[PDB]
Design a binder for this molecule. Structure first.
Ligand SMILES: CC(=O)N[C@@H]1[C@@H](O)[C@H](O)[C@@H](CO)O[C@H]1O
Ligand SMILES: CC(=O)N[C@@H]1[C@@H](O)[C@H](O)[C@@H](CO)O[C@H]1O
Ligand SMILES: CC(=O)N[C@@H]1[C@@H](O)[C@H](O)[C@@H](CO)O[C@H]1O
Ligand SMILES: CC(=O)N[C@@H]1[C@@H](O)[C@H](O)[C@@H](CO)O[C@H]1O
Ligand SMILES: CC(=O)N[C@@H]1[C@@H](O)[C@H](O)[C@@H](CO)O[C@H]1O
Ligand SMILES: CC(=O)N[C@@H]1[C@@H](O)[C@H](O)[C@@H](CO)O[C@H]1O
Ligand SMILES: CC(=O)N[C@@H]1[C@@H](O)[C@H](O)[C@@H](CO)O[C@H]1O
Ligand SMILES: Cc1ccc(C)c(N)c1
Ligand SMILES: [Cu+2]
Ligand SMILES: [Cu+2]
Ligand SMILES: [Cu+2]
Ligand SMILES: [Cu+2]
Length: 499
């Protein structure tokens, strides 16, 4: 892939991953952006060159590196109006951060409005030179990365506020729509007897996917960048922005096998080969598979996921047994989402800048009602009670700057204070199951961090909140480069359309 130091030139271009031509936001020439890679400990210097020209998809841009804690570099997190002002067309900005005690599968994508739905998204992998699970597989490179994308024929700002289905699922950049069943599919090669570490990443904007491979099992060894105890699975339900590394042994008869990624809504099923890709054993003919899907008897269940290494759940083994506990009461009034009676709306001055400029607490920070103060070095517990007042469930919630422990998973009434996995994106389940997904984390990273549903269309509608973590240490902990301090002046000078 493209080493720790690289340029990411953003432009507009007509594209047709599913056979349908449409203008989009492209990175270095392609929508599923280029795979970015590096090793644990590597310093990353990703220069984002904004050469966009299309206002309707927004000439401005900002990029978030999903999963990375960005400790000491809160200004490079990406969230527009949270940690920075957007980059302006004709300008470039350098994201320069280090990745220390982190290694696994991630991705990058615009964090400006719904722009990542229009194409600014790509996979990001950080290898571990001494990976604990290295002995469990033979191949792990550019070809074992699998990306899932919900592709729309209509641009994000031109279609419905809430699409309710993508025209086609893209696996590794390719796929078919009910109207383009002869479009080329992605092919993933495996050689007999070899074990592969496949890195499954959802770059989705709304759909969650039920992923499976005909005739093959899958051993999960990673969830959202956290090393996981090996778990043999039949199928994987992956929500927006989640990731899973699973080992697959090419131990079946040399042949072509269907790789399925069935979305929860939109064009479901596999008629005409949609929502599909191809697993091709060396020696197999270049033809479509004809293998049949069988019933899943070992579905992945988050509750069955455990950290590879013993990792203590912050706080105490009791409900609320924590320093600060917060419940997120979800709501919707039609066009907009709410969290604790507030509907997020981007402030003009980015929250990081507000704090650097003197912001002393939650009351000062804007927008009002969407910011929470978090004391440093403390245990936090948050609950997301599924309420039908919030349509669109299951809502995958995401926390920036930290990995959290899922003490209670969707579709379960258990509270695990001893063995829960840690991850950064979690499904908050749904209301007939009486779900009440609950997570915990320790405030070990000073700075303002976003917390929101990763269904971009819901984020755009205000389904978000901001955590102002340890406000006093914020400015000192996150020194900002000149280029960052210039972002806002150059962005605010732009005319509404001359974006
Ligand atoms: C991605 C997208 O929105 N595509 C639009 C298309 O629907 C519209 O008809 C055309 C105007 O001629 O502009 C382009
Ligand atoms: C000249 C050009 O590319 N303009 C496009 C327009 O056709 C399209 O409707 C929109 C959303 O994709 O982006 C812009
Ligand atoms: C290791 C294990 O659990 N065995 C399963 C088997 O029961 C199932 O029929 C098959 C489906 O592909 O995958 C394997
Ligand atoms: C935030 C929190 O965990 N505390 C509340 C507690 O005050 C209340 O009595 C209980 C029943 O509604 O729900 C929980
Ligand atoms: C008319 C009405 O009661 N609905 C409002 C809606 O217009 C507004 O956008 C939302 C968040 O401010 O609160 C509610
Ligand atoms: C998106 C937004 O700003 N919300 C507005 C709210 O301020 C206003 O009060 C309402 C009309 O009553 O329309 C909506
Ligand atoms: C209605 C519901 O089930 N949601 C619960 C809420 O009552 C409680 O305050 C919170 C703290 O444990 O956990 C969640
Ligand atoms: C409001 C609303 C209704 C239905 C779905 C599937 C989403 N995402 C959002
Ligand atoms: Cu993130
Ligand atoms: Cu994200
Ligand atoms: Cu949502
Ligand atoms: Cu985010």
């Amino acid at each position: 892939g493209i080493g720790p130091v690289a340029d990411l030139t953003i432009t507009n271009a007509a594209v047709s991953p599913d056979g349908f031509s449409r203008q989009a936001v492209v990175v270095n020439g392609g929508t599923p952006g280029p795979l970015i890679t590096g090793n644990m400990g590597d310093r990353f210097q990703l220069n984002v060159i904004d050469n966009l020209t299309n206002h309707t998809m927004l000439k401005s841009t900002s990029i978030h590196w999903h999963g990375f804690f960005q400790k000491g570099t809160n200004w490079a997190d990406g969230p527009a109006f949270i940690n920075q002002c957007p980059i302006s067309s004709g300008h470039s900005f350098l994201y320069d951060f280090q990745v220390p005690d982190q290694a696994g599968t991630f991705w990058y994508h615009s964090h400006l409005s719904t722009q990542y739905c229009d194409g600014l998204r790509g996979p990001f992998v950080v290898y571990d030179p001494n990976d604990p699970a290295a002995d469990l597989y033979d191949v792990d490179n550019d070809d074992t990365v699998i990306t899932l994308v919900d592709w729309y024929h209509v641009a994000a700002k031109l279609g419905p506020a809430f699409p309710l289905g993508a025209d086609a699922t893209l696996i590794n950049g390719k796929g078919r729509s009910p109207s383009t069943t002869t479009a080329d599919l992605s092919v993933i090669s495996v050689t007999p007897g070899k074990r592969y570490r496949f890195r499954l990443v959802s770059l989705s904007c709304d759909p969650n996917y039920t992923f499976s491979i005909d005739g093959h099992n899958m051993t999960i060894i990673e969830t959202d960048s956290i090393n996981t105890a090996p778990l043999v699975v039949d199928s994987i339900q992956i929500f927006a922005a989640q990731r899973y590394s699973f080992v697959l042994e090419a131990n079946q008869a040399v042949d072509n096998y269907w790789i399925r990624a069935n979305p929860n809504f939109g064009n479901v099923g596999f008629t005409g080969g949609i929502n599909s890709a191809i697993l091709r054993y060396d020696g197999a003919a270049a033809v479509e598979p004809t293998t049949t899907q069988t019933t899943s008897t070992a579905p992945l269940n988050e509750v069955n996921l455990h950290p590879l290494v013993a990792t203590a759940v912050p706080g105490s083994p009791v409900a609320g047994g924590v320093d600060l506990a917060i419940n997120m009461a979800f709501n919707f009034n039609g066009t907009n989402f709410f969290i604790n009676g507030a509907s997020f709306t981007p402030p003009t001055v980015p929250v990081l800048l507000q704090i650097i400029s003197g912001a002393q607490n939650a009351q000062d920070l804007l927008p009002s009602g969407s910011v929470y103060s978090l004391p440093s070095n403390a245990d936090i517990e948050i609950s997301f009670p599924a309420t039908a007042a919030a349509p669109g469930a299951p809502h995958p919630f995401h926390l920036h700057g930290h990995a959290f422990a899922v003490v209670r998973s969707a579709g379960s009434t258990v509270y695990n204070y001893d063995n829960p996995i840690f991850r950064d994106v979690v499904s908050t389940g749904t209301p007939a199951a009486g779900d009440n997904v609950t997570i915990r984390f320790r405030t070990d990273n000073p700075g303002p961090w976003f917390l929101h549903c990763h269904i971009d269309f819901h984020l755009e509608a205000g389904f978000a909140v901001v955590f102002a973590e340890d406000i006093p240490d914020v400015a000192s902990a996150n020194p900002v480069p000149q280029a960052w301090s210039d972002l806002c002046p150059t962005y605010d000078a732009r005319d509404p359309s001359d974006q």
